[PDB]
Amino acid sequence: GAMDYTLRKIKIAAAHSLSLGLLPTIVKQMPTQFTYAVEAIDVDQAVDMLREGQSDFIFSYHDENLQQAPFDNIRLFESRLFPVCANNGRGEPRYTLEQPHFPLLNYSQNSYMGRLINRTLTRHAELSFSTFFVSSMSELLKQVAMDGCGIAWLPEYAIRQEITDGRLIVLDADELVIPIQAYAYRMNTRMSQVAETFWRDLRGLQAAL
Amino acid sequence: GAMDYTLRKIKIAAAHSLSLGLLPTIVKQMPTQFTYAVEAIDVDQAVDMLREGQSDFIFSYHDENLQQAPFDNIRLFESRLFPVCANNGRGEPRYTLEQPHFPLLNYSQNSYMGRLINRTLTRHAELSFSTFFVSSMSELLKQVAMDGCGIAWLPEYAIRQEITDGRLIVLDADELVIPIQAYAYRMNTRMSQVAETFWRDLRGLQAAL
Helix, strand or coil: CCCCCCCCEEEEEEEHHHHHHHHHHHHHHCCCCCEEEEEEECHHHHHHHHHCCCCCEEEEECCCCCCCCCEEEEEEEEEEEEEEEEECCCCCECCCCCCCCEEEEECCCCCHHHHHHHHHHHHCCCCCEEEEEEECCHHHHHHHHHCCCCEEEEEHHHHHHHHHHCCEEECCCCCCCEEEEEEEEEECCCCCHHHHHHHHHHHHHHHHC | CCCCCCCCEEEEEEEHHHHHHHHHHHHHHCCCCCEEEEEEECHHHHHHHHHCCCCCEEEEECCCCCCCCCEEEEEEEEEEEEEEEEECCCCCECCCCCCCCEEEEECCCCCHHHHHHHHHHHHCCCCCEEEEEEECCHHHHHHHHHCCCCEEEEEHHHHHHHHHHCCEEECCCCCCCEEEEEEEEEECCCCCHHHHHHHHHHHHHHHHC
């Protein structure tokens, strides 16, 4: 946090859902000039950790609290959440959105994804669900969905290969698809030379993410 | 937490490193009588969440604070941490433990795994390391190791397939192997009928974990 210091350490706090997908790509593409300390957070911890200096950077989503001065940002990528479920052995979904009280696998209420998903379901009264499994961990939700336990909204980058080989099947590609946008956030304050170098390089590899 | 209640909800707090490996197996083998709320925690949050009723059960490791009355436990499985790294293209490790200041990929100090690993390295003065990447997330450490960025101590269950096809290579199988033991913890207090049914069924599938 505050007292911890090295010449090369970059302190990153990342929302649970993009930690796995985002961080390895950044490490691989970044110049060999940094060391990394990464902690997973809920989106509501982000403001305080940036203001108090416990994190140099936040990897998170759209956040109106963080999308104003004295914060700065770069949009890293955009994605789409699809409702998916396991297959039925014949290349068809095991579940339907129209089943009364279908089993839902969802993020926690404290999550950015969970908030958008419930907003969506509310708008759509022709769907009724029972929540079978709640977890902040995207990869846990994905595995429980792959094991056939219910329907889950998951981001495209996490399920890309499972959609291609059909271990997961997309159940809707219109009004139930949820847009999401990933950002890196910082304080406007000028930082150390190494953190400024990290920020500059991050801008330069954003295209390749 | 406390006020949240349904007839079937089982509230579980799990240490970061066994959440992915353990939880899907439990859901799959358990009778279809439960719903799940799972949150990831650091091991030091476990005592307070059990005493205050925010969690029914804790999935964690050996914890002397939790291995005494009024707590109860069942050992779920034991495993072994191996130092591993990516291959060098010829079926050999890319890194050696004997390289001066080899790049270490480690858990945070707040983690059970991190504590045992540093205890081990300290005992072994013929090794010197520089910490390249720190994260609580086992799956992030595994991916960074697979991408060739350094040496990491990882549990056998998480790297089993990568060891078999040689995307990760074990660097030591004697004095650097670290034993670990996974437990489920509860309060001694008698709980609701549904939580007692969950506890009884958990005992019954422990063999198959």
